[PDB]
Structure 1
């Protein structure tokens, strides 16, 4: 059966199943999926472009811009001009956003550890390395 070992189907199912487990925790802590993705992606990061944020959060850019309108209104993120290009807007998490998301990030790390524990450190690191290499080869 083609679909049983078709890579894009395997990636999508694993991603949906693992993510859906953590989304229940995020909601119990008052976060939407998109708010969790944005704050977790900006935590501990230097300011990044809207386009970079859209790529790492797998969210369409117009959706990200609307999300940032409301997250900035709530003081959780800040948009700022690029030091050179008028075309580029950068975005950062604020202290308020970081404090709001820190505990959830620790829960996310615990959930990830539980997901990866049956595989062992070797297989877990190999998976993460392969995924990172694939992203870096296919990102635009």
Structure 2
């Protein structure tokens, strides 16, 4: 069966299933998926471009700009001139800190059956693939 071992389908299914688990927690804590992805991607980071944010949040850039309009209105992020850069504010960081701890706990549960060796191998392969395929 073609799809059983086809890499793009395997990545798409694993990503959907694991993300959907944590997105439920995010909503129970008052976050939309896109709001969570933006705040998680900006936490602890220097200001990054809107295009970089769109890539790491796997969201199209026009959608991201519209998201940032409302999140900046709420004081959770700030856009700045360098190309537009964007950063999380202290308000946004404090809003998402607890959720980030829950996200780390969920990740630890997802990876514990695989062991540290296989978990680190997976993360390294994924990071290498991203860095090879990003534009």
TM-score normalized by the length of structure 2: 1.00
Unaligned runs of 5+ in 2: none
Aligned-residue offset at 1:19:
0.2
Unaligned runs of 5+ in 1: 83-87
Determine helix, strand or coil for the equivalent of 1:117. helix
Deviation track 1:17-64 (CA, whole Å, cap 9, x = no partner) reads 000000000000000000000000000000000000000000000000
Rounded to whole Å, the distance in 2 between the matches of 1:2 and 1:135 is 24
Deviation track 1:51-108 (CA, whole Å, cap 9, x = no partner) reads 00000000000000000000000000000000xxxxx000000000000000000000
Aligned-residue offset at 1:9:
0.1
Aligned-residue offset at 1:109:
0.1
Determine helix, strand or coil for the equivalent of 1:4. helix
Rounded to whole Å, the distance in 1 between the matches of 2:21 and 2:133 is 27
Say how many residue pairs are matched: 135
Which of 122, 126, 129 is matched with 1:127 structurally? Answer: 122
Rounded to whole Å, the distance in 1 between the matches of 2:89 and 2:116 is 34
- Structure 1's consecutive aligned runs of 4 or more residues displaced over 2 angstroms after TM superposition are none
**CA RMSD for the aligned pairs?**
0.2
TM-score normalized by the length of structure 1: 0.96
Aligned-residue offset at 1:4:
0.1
Rounded to whole Å, the distance in 2 between the matches of 1:113 and 1:32 is 22
Report the counterpart of residue 98 of structure 1 in structure 2: 93
Report the counterpart of residue 38 of structure 1 in structure 2: 38
Aligned-residue offset at 1:133:
0.1
Determine helix, strand or coil for the equivalent of 1:79. strand
